[model samples]
Target: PDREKALELAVAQIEKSYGKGSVMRLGDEARQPISVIPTGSIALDVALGIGGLPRGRVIEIYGPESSGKTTVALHAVANAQAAGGVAAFIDAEHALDPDYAKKLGVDTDSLLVSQPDTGEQALEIADMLIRSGALDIVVIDSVAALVPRAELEGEHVGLQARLMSQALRKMTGALNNSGTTAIFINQLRTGGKALKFYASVRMDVRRVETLKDGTNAVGNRTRVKVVKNKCSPPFKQAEFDILYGKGISREGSLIDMGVDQGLIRKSGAWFTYEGEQLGQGKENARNFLVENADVADEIEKKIKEKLGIGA
Candidate 1:
């Protein structure tokens, strides 16, 4: 009947609940920077500003099978745990591998795994995890297979969306203030469906070409695209590699980046890139990057034209 009066009344009520000037202020000084845990790859971390996976926010990492999505999240987990924080993994797909996680530097003793029968229980546990003040990060090792209990027990029509909304509604406030990073691993379907939940950052990943010449996978790389970033400027693409047993490799791109940083000199295939002599093959790059020479973040730039990575 009275739309204008109704609108003003609603505004007054919002002010009462949210405090004056807290509803939606738009300015540089209005928002503070959210903290981030750096991904293991220094090059990527620098390029993406660690992709701004804000602390106390929801981050979703989605990709095809074997695309290293979990690897990225686990790296963050290990980093967070190293900072004296704990982590939890809600293995909805039963894909939590303790041995692999440990090998990736995740402190198994500092991490807990929970397998909920349905999406509802997973969300409940997530609420508890964030509220417990004991965990700094929680990963749902995927949202693709989270079937609700009602589906298993009763009607199963369009339950996934409802569960997703409920989970997001219940967890958003906690995530915004819990000071913990929540990672949800999702998979893309052929039909182009996406996660129903809101996320601060969404990454789409694809397998970069392999370095194996013959049959062995001596090293592997993946291309991660920052599809969305709510906390910082976005990036087109970033690459990271796994050196078979070494987890993440840096020989190829590392040397190139070193050159870009002026940390190394080169001449006719000569690589002072690592220190000492300037002439070596692709063979000496790894040892040079890790032990022979020194590396840091300041001079660290890009290896744009490198074979193993993108600019």
Candidate 2:
């Protein structure tokens, strides 16, 4: 083809893909959504500009064991289902339990689980799910385990990573075209100097703070950092306390939508939401406590009533 003809074809294609007066003409707009996945926590989601996770992108969640990675994945599944869409959980590590799904309020009838023990098998299942074009959200639990253990070295590792990422990208493109969203769970590794990196959207899980002075402090205290959020400019780090419960109570009624703000403590550790020391060491703890003092008062009143103490 002639050079000018090729250039004209490219411009035509651009005009076809985007409107004639699209901002792409000025090279200023991104062709992707601003967010990829909701954190399933209201406060955190608000910090993310009220933008839900991108519909057709791969979001990588990396963390060590017991870092609430699985919780986040399950939460995403539940969120998708709540939005009236089918969701799938591709279990690369066979770590998903049926009861756990029930606890998270994931509609199993609309959820598909693929338990693949081998890396190749996982990839195959992923491709199959993506090609089905029937799912609204598909989650691959831990991409690290999806790569052959023997292939975790040298150029082979890079090749495999690229290959897997490419497969995810292909699926992402297809899903985005179909208005679906995909998530990949990644296990954290120690060798890299950079805190975190992503072929797409990457989130790193780590311990941020703990309620050191409280009697309730136990287990790991962790927070999520947007190591690389390609969907949007990196966001401020968020802290969440992992809590045990099926749902959060608000004004004596249960809420099953979005994240439960009351369940996540600012110190990244479990405590009574009405506890006095919650905001002592946190950067915005005081402000958070001040703003939600009414909530604290209500909780305290409930506790006092339960204890038969006069308020």
Candidate 3:
């Protein structure tokens, strides 16, 4: 009893020496829960398992050329805008296709687009936007395209990597409790060690096949793998189609996955979705859901419940 009394006295002395509430008990502080932003791809969102991407964290989507990285980034931006949240796009590569962003449903008028002259400038802009509490999401077009200011004027070999590390440090520091999400699009070969280290989630997108319509290419059959996920389980994957000009197709996504999971009954050409004879043939069923948002949402909720992610 005397030992316990002395321990309490020591803690009290330390608290007084510092300040009240300076010395906190472990697990005593309450924390604000992180918010969720849907990636606009239902399949990818289901793979994430948190219903969507977690807010206030860094996400890296890297892959080869024409792998749909920009599409995925803008898809998130579009979703944020759809929810009445502001978004910014840091086009470090100076290659943002405004028409394509519009095709992907991004609100070009409200988006803050920045083509920084240097890597530090890009990251600093991102830091400012994140800390301003005015934006919900900030997408840095690419880490590979960011060139350090010094390297632009002089032959500073390996300077980009060094600045990348420092820039990421400052950007991540500003991200703490900022309630803004940052998405970085990167290439396969480049200075990405620091990006991999600082990224909360790293997704690798690969174009597996080309969807064709007779003589023309219609879309790409891409696979998205969540290689690293601090927000939820890692290594989960999903495959979907990205139609050119049309963006990620929500049509037929539910019907395909729903049938595989036994949520949608399929026999020959006829199908039943949500315990109702929806239509005949896969195409009909897909169009039915696309035209009927109410049924589509109902089946989406059912799928979420089956996956144990429903509220």
Best by lDDT: 3
Give the per-residue Cα lDDT of candidate 2 at 156.
26
Number of clashes recorded per candidate: 1, 5, 0
Predicted candidate 1 versus true structure: per-residue lDDT over 113-145, tens digit per residue: 898887788879888889886778999878877
Q: After superposition, how far is residue 160 of candidate 2 from its true place, in Å?
A: 2.9
To one decimal, what is the Cα RMSD in angstroms of model 3 from the true structure?
7.2
User: What does the lDDT read for residue 146 in candidate 2?
Assistant: 67
Clashes by residue pair, model 2? 35-54, 36-53, 36-54, 37-53, 55-180
Model 3 scores worst on lDDT over the 10 consecutive residues at 24-33
> By summed lDDT, which 10 consecutive residues of candidate 1 come out lowest?
23-32
- Could you tell me which residue pairs clash in candidate 1? 271-278
Query: What overall lDDT goes with each candidate model?
Result: 0.69, 0.56, 0.80
Error of 2 at 15 (Å): 14
Query: On a 0 to 1 TM-score scale, where does candidate 1 land against the true structure?
Result: 0.78
Among the numbered candidates, top TM-score falls to 3
User: Which segments of candidate 3 are over 4 A away from where they belong?
Assistant: 1-34, 274-281
**Candidate 2 per-residue lDDT over residues 1-311, each given as its tens digit:** 59979877887887788543221222232333433455555334433332446666667777887777777777778877886778878876777776766776778776887777566667677777777777778887766666654564322234455556555545555765766666777776621222133234566777555434367653344577765554444544555554444321121111111113354234453233534544443324434543676764554445324323221
TM-scores of the models, in the order given:
0.78, 0.61, 0.84
